[PDB]
Amino acid sequence: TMPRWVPLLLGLLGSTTCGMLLYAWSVFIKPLNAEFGWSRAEIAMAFAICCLIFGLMTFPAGRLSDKMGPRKVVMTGGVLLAIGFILSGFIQSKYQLYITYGVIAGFGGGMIYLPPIATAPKWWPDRRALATGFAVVGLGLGSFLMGPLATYIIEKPGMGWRYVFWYCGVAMGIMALIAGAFLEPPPAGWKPAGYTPKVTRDWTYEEAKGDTKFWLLYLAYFCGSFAGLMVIGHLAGFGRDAGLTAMAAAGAVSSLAFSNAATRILSGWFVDKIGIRVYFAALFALQTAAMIAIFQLGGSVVGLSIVAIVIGWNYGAMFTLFPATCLQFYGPTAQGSNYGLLFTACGLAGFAGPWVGGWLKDTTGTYYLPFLCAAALCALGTAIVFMTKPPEKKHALELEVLFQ
Numbered sequence: 001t002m003p004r005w006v007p008l009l010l011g012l013l014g015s016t017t018c019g020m021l022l023y024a025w026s027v028f029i030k031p032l033n034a035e036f037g038w039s040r041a042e043i044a045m046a047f048a049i050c051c052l053i054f055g056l057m058t059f060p061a062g063r064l065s066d067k068m069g070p071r072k073v074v075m076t077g078g079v080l081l082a083i084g085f086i087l088s089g090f091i092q093s094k095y096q097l098y099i100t101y102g103v104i105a106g107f108g109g110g111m112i113y114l115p116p117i118a119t120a121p122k123w124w125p126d127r128r129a130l131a132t133g134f135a136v137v138g139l140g141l142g143s144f145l146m147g148p149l150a151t152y153i154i155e156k157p158g159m160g161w162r163y164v165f166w167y168c169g170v171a172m173g174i175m176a177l178i179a180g181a182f183l184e185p186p187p188a189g190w191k192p193a194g195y196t197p198k199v200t201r202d203w204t205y206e207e208a209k210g211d212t213k214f215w216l217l218y219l220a221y222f223c224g225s226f227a228g229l230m231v232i233g234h235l236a237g238f239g240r241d242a243g244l245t246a247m248a249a250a251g252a253v254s255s256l257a258f259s260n261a262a263t264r265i266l267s268g269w270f271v272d273k274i275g276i277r278v279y280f281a282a283l284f285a286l287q288t289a290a291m292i293a294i295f296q297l298g299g300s301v302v303g304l305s306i307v308a309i310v311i312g313w314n315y316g317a318m319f320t321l322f323p324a325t326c327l328q329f330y331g332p333t334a335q336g337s338n339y340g341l342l343f344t345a346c347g348l349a350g351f352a353g354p355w356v357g358g359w360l361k362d363t364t365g366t367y368y369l370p371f372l373c374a375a376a377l378c379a380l381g382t383a384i385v386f387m388t389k390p391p392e393k394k395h396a397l398e399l400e401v402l403f404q
């Protein structure tokens with residue numbers, strides 16, 4: 001039937017839509033402060049709510065993808081996201097923005113984000129991590145797509161920021177319905193392959209949800225996610241506090257987008273080739289080192305760029321390597337439910353991390369506390385990821401007894 005790279009194209013489209021959604025809020029920071037008396041933090045609340053609901057709704061999305069297939073889930077998410085974003089176009093208050101952009105659009109976003117992550121590796125048992133990376137690279141591409149687009153619409157005279165919400169919400173709804181229309185696992189029996197009585201079987205959602213290793217992974221995910229979201233918003237400020245012009249600090253930090261995107265594909269390919277655990281742990285460790293190293297490298301465009309690139313490499317790699325690791329531990333059959341639950345860690349980190357980093361800075365007036373805490377969290381994650389080896393594969397005695 002369909003060539004098994006179509007799934008990858010689909011995940012690229014859906015994750016790109018999700019990246020556009022999660023990038024928009026910064027676009028609207030200045031227009032909304034011009035129209036209303038709304039603070040940056042008041043709008044950042046809209047973004048944080050979006051992350052909370054998005055990360056939470058992956059879990060119902062994965063359960064529903066597993067139960068009734070990924071197509072229905074992704075297309076419903078396209079509907080919800082289109083509704084919430086477009087209604088943000090028609091807002092007049094803060095709570096309307098929180099509801100439209102934060103809750104509705106984020107709901108649709110999680111339902112778009114997850115099912116492809118669970119479906120693509122099923123078409124690619126020889127390259128599971130690369131398939132997953134194609135399901136997530138769109139979150140690194142969404143900024144590059146929306147930035148110029150949202151600027152173009154806001155600055156045009158007959159238009160405005162509400163026009164960004166309206167037109168971009170139609171565009172994203174279309175891309176997500178197109179993505180979710182063509183998404184389905186391979187057929188129940190024959191597996192697309194040129195190549196390939198004890199009988200094992202994949203884990204069930206209830207079996208994995210009860211494993212201690214699932215929750216060690218959950219803890220590690222929360223730790224790495226939280227560290228990144230706690231400091232990334234501070235990189236450029238660290239630069240300016242070190243003496244750089246705002247322009248120069250901003251240029252340096254912008255390399256984070258390129259590495260954040262590239263790592264998602266490249267790391268998947270690497271671990272497909274050499275295995276997950278050791279490279280994964282090294283990324284967390286290097287992330288620990290970077291949180292420390294900024295106090296020595298962060299005062300020059302070259303150094304700050306190195307830190308931004310590294311931080312982006314390790315941060316972005318988490319969103320391929322955690323689903324790949326979960327796939328290795330429990331298998332693809334219940335990957336929708338298993339990884340949907342696991343991503344709720346990111347939902348919570350997205351809600352709290354940026355706020356907590358800001359509070360630590362403003363409490364102390366310096367960057368030592370947030371970056372030191374991020375380093376500790378990345379050190380814990382290093383420990384967990386390095387020490388956690390796959391659980392035992394499951395015997396399937398119900399299938400096993402079928403042999404005379």
Ligand SMILES: O=C(O)CCc1ccccc1
Pocket residue numbers: 051052054055136139140319346347349350
């Ligand atoms: O980069 C990603 O793959 C998603 C990042 C994220 C974090 C928290 C909530 C939603 C999405």
